[PDB]
């Protein structure tokens, strides 16, 4: 808000840089160690094997991933680009905070 007579506004304890650092640490942990870092020490694992773990979790065998890795990677990249385009399309998705 503004600054005027009668009232004042206090700054938050955590700055935006610290929140960004927290999110970056979470992203690095979740893309370099899977879900192992959420229960203890982070354990390194290649991303393809983590994806095979997740596919086995959802009920599909891992051989279909190992035989269709390039297609899945291309679909993921296209989906990320589509999310970027939709977010830049000035859609009313950020209305929850604005309200």
């Amino acid at each position: 808000a503004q600054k005027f007579n009668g009232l004042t506004v206090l700054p938050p304890l955590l700055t935006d840089e610290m929140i960004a650092q927290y999110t970056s640490a979470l992203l690095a942990g979740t893309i370099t160690s899977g879900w192992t870092f959420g229960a203890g020490a982070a354990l390194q694992i290649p991303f393809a094997m983590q994806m095979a773990y997740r596919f086995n979790g959802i009920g599909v065998t891992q051989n279909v991933l190992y035989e269709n890795q390039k297609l899945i990677a291309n679909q993921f990249n296209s989906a990320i680009g589509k999310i970027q385009d939709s977010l830049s399309s000035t859609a009313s998705a950020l209305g929850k905070l604005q309200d």
Binding site: A41, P46, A48, M49, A52, T61, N63, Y66, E67, Q69
Partner: protein, 99 residues
């Protein structure tokens, strides 16, 4: 978990499992033997430098690679990062003993 009583609440005692004393090895997505790719039914293929074994995901317990704990799906010309180790089948020694 075990519950406990409080004057105006409840106290929960949670017993959990935490792994420790980690060690790192070398892994491969699959094993190519006789022109066929073999995938583990459970666990992953690990190597200590000279030999390949099969262990659990959350605990280290090396096992000899066998047709019993592996399944075959297609040839080994499509999986990226496959290795060229052999597998074991006890049926051949069982047949050899029947002489």
């Amino acid at each position: 978990s075990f519950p406990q009583s409080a004057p105006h609440g409840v106290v929960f005692l949670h017993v959990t499992y935490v792994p420790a004393q980690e060690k790192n090895f070398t892994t491969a997505p699959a094993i190519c033997h006789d022109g066929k790719a073999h995938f583990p039914r459970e666990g992953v293929f690990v190597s200590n430098g000279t030999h390949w074994f099969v262990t659990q995901r959350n605990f280290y317990e090396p096992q000899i690679i066998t047709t019993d704990n592996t399944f075959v799906s297609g040839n080994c010309d499509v999986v990226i990062g496959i290795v060229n180790n052999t597998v074991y089948d006890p049926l051949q020694p069982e047949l050899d003993s029947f002489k």
